[PDB]
Design an enzyme around this catalytic site. Sequence first.
Site, short mmCIF file in Angstrom:
data_model
loop_
_atom_site.label_atom_id
_atom_site.label_comp_id
_atom_site.label_asym_id
_atom_site.label_seq_id
_atom_site.Cartn_x
_atom_site.Cartn_y
_atom_site.Cartn_z
CD1 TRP A 241 -8.97 6.26 4.81
CD2 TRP A 241 -9.02 3.85 4.44
NE1 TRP A 241 -8.17 5.57 5.64
CE2 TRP A 241 -8.23 4.31 5.62
CE3 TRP A 241 -8.88 2.55 4.13
CZ2 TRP A 241 -7.25 3.41 6.38
CZ3 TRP A 241 -8.08 1.60 4.83
CH2 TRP A 241 -7.19 2.10 5.99
CE1 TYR B 165 -5.17 14.52 3.65
CE2 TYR B 165 -5.31 12.77 2.61
CZ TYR B 165 -5.29 13.21 3.57
OH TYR B 165 -5.24 12.19 5.04
CG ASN C 239 -1.51 1.35 1.36
OD1 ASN C 239 -2.53 1.68 0.63
ND2 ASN C 239 -1.31 2.22 2.47
CD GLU C 240 -1.19 5.66 0.41
OE1 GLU C 240 -0.56 6.12 1.79
OE2 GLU C 240 -2.18 6.35 0.14
O1 LIG Z 1 -5.01 9.48 4.79
C1 LIG Z 1 -5.92 8.59 4.87
O2 LIG Z 1 -6.98 9.09 5.76
C2 LIG Z 1 -5.65 7.09 4.74
O3 LIG Z 1 -4.98 6.98 3.46
C3 LIG Z 1 -3.57 6.28 3.44
N1 LIG Z 1 -2.65 7.29 3.13
C4 LIG Z 1 -3.13 8.32 2.24
C5 LIG Z 1 -2.16 9.38 1.70
N2 LIG Z 1 -1.28 9.85 2.81
C6 LIG Z 1 -1.61 11.17 3.34
N3 LIG Z 1 -1.59 11.43 4.68
N4 LIG Z 1 -1.64 12.51 5.09
N5 LIG Z 1 -1.84 13.72 4.49
C7 LIG Z 1 -1.67 13.77 2.99
C8 LIG Z 1 -1.50 12.43 2.51
S1 LIG Z 1 -1.30 12.72 0.66
C9 LIG Z 1 -1.33 14.52 0.86
N6 LIG Z 1 -1.42 15.42 -0.17
C10 LIG Z 1 -1.36 16.75 0.15
N7 LIG Z 1 -1.40 17.74 -0.98
C11 LIG Z 1 -0.38 18.75 -0.86
C12 LIG Z 1 -0.61 19.92 -1.92
O4 LIG Z 1 -1.22 19.65 -2.99
C13 LIG Z 1 -2.09 18.44 -3.00
C14 LIG Z 1 -1.75 17.40 -2.31
C15 LIG Z 1 -1.53 17.21 1.67
C16 LIG Z 1 -1.74 16.30 2.45
C17 LIG Z 1 -1.35 14.96 2.16
C18 LIG Z 1 -1.59 16.52 3.96
C19 LIG Z 1 -1.12 18.00 4.46
C20 LIG Z 1 -1.80 18.96 3.28
C21 LIG Z 1 -1.53 18.79 1.67
C22 LIG Z 1 -0.98 8.62 3.73
C23 LIG Z 1 -2.26 8.22 4.04
C24 LIG Z 1 -3.29 5.44 4.47
O5 LIG Z 1 -3.02 4.38 3.99
C25 LIG Z 1 -4.27 5.36 5.55
O6 LIG Z 1 -3.67 4.76 6.75
C26 LIG Z 1 -5.00 6.49 5.95
O7 LIG Z 1 -5.70 6.47 7.18
#
Ligand SMILES: O=C(O)[C@H]1O[C@@H](N2CCN(c3nnnc4c3sc3nc(N5CCOCC5)c5c(c34)CCCC5)CC2)[C@H](O)[C@@H](O)[C@@H]1O
Lengths: 643, 644
Positions: A512, A439, A377-378
Amino acid sequence: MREVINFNTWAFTKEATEVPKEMPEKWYWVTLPHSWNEIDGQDGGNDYYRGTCYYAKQLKKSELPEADCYYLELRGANASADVYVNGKAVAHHDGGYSTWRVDITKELTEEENLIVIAVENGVNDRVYPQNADFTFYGGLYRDVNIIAVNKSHFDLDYYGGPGIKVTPEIKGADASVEVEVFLTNAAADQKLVYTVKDAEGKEVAKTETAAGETKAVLSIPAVHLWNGKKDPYLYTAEVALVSGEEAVDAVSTRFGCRTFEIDPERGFILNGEEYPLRGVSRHQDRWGIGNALLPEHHREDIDLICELGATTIRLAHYQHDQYFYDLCDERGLVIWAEIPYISSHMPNGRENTISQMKELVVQNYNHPSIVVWGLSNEITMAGSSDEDLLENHRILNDMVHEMDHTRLTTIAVVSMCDIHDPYIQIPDVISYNHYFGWYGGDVSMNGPWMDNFHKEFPNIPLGMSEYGCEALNWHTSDPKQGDYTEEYQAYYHEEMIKQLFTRKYIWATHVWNMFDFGADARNEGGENGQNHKGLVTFDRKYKKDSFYAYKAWLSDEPFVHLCGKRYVDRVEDTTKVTVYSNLPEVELFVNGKSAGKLQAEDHFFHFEVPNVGESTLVAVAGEYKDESHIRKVDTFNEEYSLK
Amino acid sequence: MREVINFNTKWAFTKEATEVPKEMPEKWYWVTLPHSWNEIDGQDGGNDYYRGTCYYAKQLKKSELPEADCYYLELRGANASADVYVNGKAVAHHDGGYSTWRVDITKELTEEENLIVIAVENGVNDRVYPQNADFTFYGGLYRDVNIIAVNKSHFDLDYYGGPGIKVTPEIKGADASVEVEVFLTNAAADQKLVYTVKDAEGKEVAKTETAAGETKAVLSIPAVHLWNGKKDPYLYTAEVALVSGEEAVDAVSTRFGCRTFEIDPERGFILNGEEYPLRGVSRHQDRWGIGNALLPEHHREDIDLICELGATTIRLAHYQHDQYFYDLCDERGLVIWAEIPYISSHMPNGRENTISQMKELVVQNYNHPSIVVWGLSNEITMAGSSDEDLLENHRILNDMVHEMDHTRLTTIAVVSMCDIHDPYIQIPDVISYNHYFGWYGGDVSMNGPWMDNFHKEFPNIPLGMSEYGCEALNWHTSDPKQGDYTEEYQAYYHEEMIKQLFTRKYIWATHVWNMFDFGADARNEGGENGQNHKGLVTFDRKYKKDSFYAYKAWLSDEPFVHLCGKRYVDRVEDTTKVTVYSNLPEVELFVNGKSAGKLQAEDHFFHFEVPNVGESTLVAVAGEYKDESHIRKVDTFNEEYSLK
Ligand SMILES: O=C(O)[C@H]1O[C@@H](N2CCN(c3nnnc4c3sc3nc(N5CCOCC5)c5c(c34)CCCC5)CC2)[C@H](O)[C@@H](O)[C@@H]1O
Ligand SMILES: O=C(O)[C@H]1O[C@@H](N2CCN(c3nnnc4c3sc3nc(N5CCOCC5)c5c(c34)CCCC5)CC2)[C@H](O)[C@@H](O)[C@@H]1O
Ligand SMILES: Cc1cc2nc3c(=O)[nH]c(=O)nc-3n(C[C@H](O)[C@H](O)[C@H](O)COP(=O)(O)O)c2cc1C
Ligand SMILES: Cc1cc2nc3c(=O)[nH]c(=O)nc-3n(C[C@H](O)[C@H](O)[C@H](O)COP(=O)(O)O)c2cc1C
């Protein structure tokens, strides 16, 4: 004569540094399931204690039935554990989500024997998971059992498997079922009797060969196919090992007869007919008990899921409890099982990926509900794939493909990963984790993205293994991404459902998450230590409005649901009102006067009604009603806003 | 009838395995132990040396084994964590790659050809020290792997890899009351124990008998020859045998020395009543080309060079060393500081490892008379001031050491910037600081005033200098500056450090860092990456740097004369200075045969000036000893001399 004894009722501490030489007297008492992260792992700050803790319990040979050998079975010890009997190290395991065992017959030298189990959940470059958005609840969070068996027994030492391997083959309207067993210390003169039993237990097949032949093929005429929720039929395979005509040991396992396909254009096919896989993912924890769930917690989770009408569950990010896989067997849910190979590839973790993956397949090969094995996963979140990442995957793909010819391998890809990355081409099918509309981006982007992948790779079946959006008890009349409002999360899923549910080529979609879950590093939305993207709250007490959006599309339960019940004080003079229902026509009454009768393609009935004084709304669809109240006010009640 | 069998030859090795092999590998790489897979990639830099899990495999043919009741596998050194398999069966794990451990494997020798698989691992985790240190964590079976055949009833082999015998002498006047403690396994209540303590020539000097049930005896030796350091490293040997009838079915022995000592806060080290200044060096257990896979001759050569230097103590950092090398220190009268790799950063979850390694250190080396202090940690507050977990960790070790060993003291190596009022300094018996004033910024002259200032504030804690040093490659200048890496500045640095430290009797022990250059794969400085170049000798032991001779002048009674700067030939100045080290009183220097003057150096640092004209040949004379060198006037500085 094989017997199982529960061993759950244990002295515990986090301060020991060494196996105690006699029974501790000042340690804290626990009964398993147990985890020491129940509180500190759900409140935030990423401060949940991660280290080595010790359990101590005395095993009295007296209070024990007598067999030729006694095994200690451990259904779940997160993450790495060591087992001592009377001070002597006897077994070690790495992996908090699988069953392992250990023969301790020779270590029971005393009348009263001290069993000490040390468990550890710290940082290191060997054992997965290490980088994930979910708490690594430490301890013995599943049962601890004692198995007493004859000297000759079916295998208990091969990767904690059941010792029996059933493989149905469907020839026309009949089934030819290979039932392979594995024995330990078997005499050449013993016999194995194979019986295949009816759903009502009526013997339908039986054969008898000598111990030397651990494989047999039994026919099932006019076989009732495991057809999922339509008809999740289960046979029972049962092998006994006989000495003389005494049966000294016996094992069994329920099983299902089914064929399936994952057409890259028609989506999922079950027993010959299209069977759209639309559903959710579920974590194995609950508020306040960490991951020390009891059977009723599993029952309640599946009941809530089946009430939603999901036909598939993604059981991320790891192997779940056997009892929950059983429930999925009985109810007809098509399941996606995976290993905790996530986020960042640790080269030195390759052994652990292979170890857990083997226990996953061996221990769960007989679950008809499972159809794909997820490798990672990822896994490219850190960066584009390495040669070591690619080799680690190929090794797992080939290993799974050789062990199980009946299922497919899959991958859950991080949203950003280039679709031309070499690792996507390794497994049979793939699914993406996309959070367009939470996101960043817009929820309207999802549909197009999936299409554009399918144009590029029209023969790789593409699923949506993750999509979601955060939702707490915040409310607003102008939903906007980032406010954490129940309303916006409801709007998000409305658009997601309309985009995904109408695209047959997406072989499976997974919300999810089904429930809020523990992630002690989360510190957002007004409540820390939790991922709030669920359709139901962490304690399974409150179904969010989005839960009913999915019931409208997938459940055969007639119902009517007023959304917004928790958003009462509103400022606007006219207010929007939304009813979810799987029924054709819905009429809304504000204070007894009908506001109109509506139908809806998408089951989302959007009303607009005047907001004057205190009003009572009532939705009626045939013989079904629901009740909401609202109230005009002059200024926005800031108690609704996160701020 | 106990028999030790070497088991080092022909082992199959791989870094690419994923599981224990079921049959004997046919395509693995052949190695003979001592072995380490980091012998090259761990001494070249980049911090890229492979760390993970690698497998050793070798067959054990039962027939080739002598007849005994039990067969133990012994491992002197497996860095860092290892697992043992015998015919696919797991039978032992270990954490800590510097201690001895054993495992009884009799019952798994079920075949004539038994597959032994040892998995060795040196990865990253929060449990096993070291994890952050300035030296390579060489992986593999870098020490002997033996097989021990003993009788069913035998001396203890399963207590933290100990010797099964614990000898503790008490000095009552001109006599010694020697306590002899042995530990048994499956001993019959009707067997006896014969304790005998023999001479330095092997002549029996005391002997007592007792039944197996009394594993503790006190034998007397009158007019005992004390172990008195280099002045007289006298060594008795203890010898206990387990008899069934008048068969002797097993027997253990150990050398020991009887000595008393004190670490006075003002008089420094005191040995057997007389002041005995401890001024010496540190030493790592690696060597250029073979990682840490040392053979006896390398241990012999290492201490030989130290003895030539005349050092009276060695700091065997940062871990337990090889048993052979502790013995040599016993034989040569060197006073040894031993420690565990609890270093740099305090890991809460590493606590259990600190206790296991520290327990192993004390059990496995209690008997070495050369050891007087057990070190708890080195620069443990580097990554922050002392917190409660760090302080409980240290108190736990301190008390355990004090409980197992009443005859030694505990110390620590404090990082330099650590506030002297940290509660951490108050836990152990004595302490020493690691100061690099004159290398890591600062100025060499600051060392004296700093040590004076601590001594004023804490008069009652014996303070030492556990680490001082300066890098030195093959670079040269006539204008030494901190940071040019020249052999000259490193010699000047150690001259000043000698005049400051060697004249302060209250410093209970000084340890030059380091005696030899050593493997530190994360370093990339000085013109040769992968090494720390702070030694007095180079990594391959082939070149004694000038700084080496500065200390020999102060500590050796081997009369000699050394011209420094032999490798700095072409020089630009018309007048050039020439440094001569000698432990004799007078040194005369000759330029092309003509004498440029006599000199008497109180500090043994003879600093002459001479003209630099054409090709000059320099000769230094001190009585019947002479030394030679060559210099040459040139128009421009030779760029081959400067790091640049
Ligand atoms: O996350 C969930 O809910 C569930 O999904 C999975 N994973 C998804 C992706 N991943 C992330 N986790 N936390 N934050 C971000 C990502 S990606 C992303 N992209 C972002 N942007 C940046 C600017 O421009 C567009 C994209 C931003 C953020 C995140 C958060 C801060 C603000 C901007 C890890 C977790 C996990 O398997 C799961 O266990 C988890 O529960
Ligand atoms: O180093 C050795 O050889 C031995 O010494 C001991 N330890 C000493 C301190 N420690 C360091 N290791 N490497 N570099 C620095 C330190 S501290 C420090 N402070 C510095 N500045 C602070 C501000 O003002 C000016 C000086 C600077 C540097 C360092 C390096 C770059 C230039 C500035 C770890 C090792 C170890 O016990 C030993 O295992 C090791 O082998
Ligand atoms: C679902 C499944 C369950 C299995 N269970 C056992 C078992 O219980 N005992 C056994 O000896 N082999 C079992 N096997 C297969 C063999 O263990 C395996 O294919 C082969 O013997 C390799 O063993 P190894 O993994 O130790 O190298 C099972 C295979 C599958 C696919
Ligand atoms: C240097 C030294 C060596 C020792 N060696 C042994 C030994 O080999 N066998 C043994 O049973 N006890 C030995 N002891 C002492 C006991 O192990 C100790 O007093 C007590 O048994 C602690 O046991 P534990 O570490 O398992 O808690 C030794 C003690 C010291 C100080």
